[PDB]
Design a protein around this ligand. Structure first.
Ligand SMILES: [Zn+2]
Ligand SMILES: [Zn+2]
Lengths: 67, 34
């Protein structure tokens, strides 16, 4: 229910899957980047990769939904 | 210990999520400190 066109770059679904929304956000410290789905974000650090944007270490991931 | 049962929601501000919790821009509600 987003309403801001500048944000359209952030509002994209999971870029790896595009089968599900971007419900995988990566927290590093006090900020986090919304970049993939929850499943991909978990798999990403398992592969040894850090945040794809800022490469700051992934402390945790959260599962967002409207439920 | 500051967690809420529905902390797994996208919130726009602290008042956008139930319970005694705050909202981060990273779509996380709550403050697990204490
Ligand atoms: Zn990041
Ligand atoms: Zn994905």
């Amino acid at each position: 229910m987003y309403s801001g066109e500048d944000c359209q770059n952030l509002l994209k679904p999971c870029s790896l899957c595009e089968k599900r929304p971007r419900d995988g956000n990566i927290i590093h410290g006090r900020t986090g980047h919304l970049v993939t789905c929850f499943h991909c974000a978990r798999r990403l650090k398992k592969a040894g990769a850090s945040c794809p944007i800022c490469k700051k270490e992934i402390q945790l991931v959260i599962k967002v939904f409207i439920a | 210990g500051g967690v809420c049962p529905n902390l797994y929601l996208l919130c726009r501000r602290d008042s956008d999520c139930p319970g005694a919790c705050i909202c981060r821009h990273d779509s996380y509600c709550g403050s697990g400190s204490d």
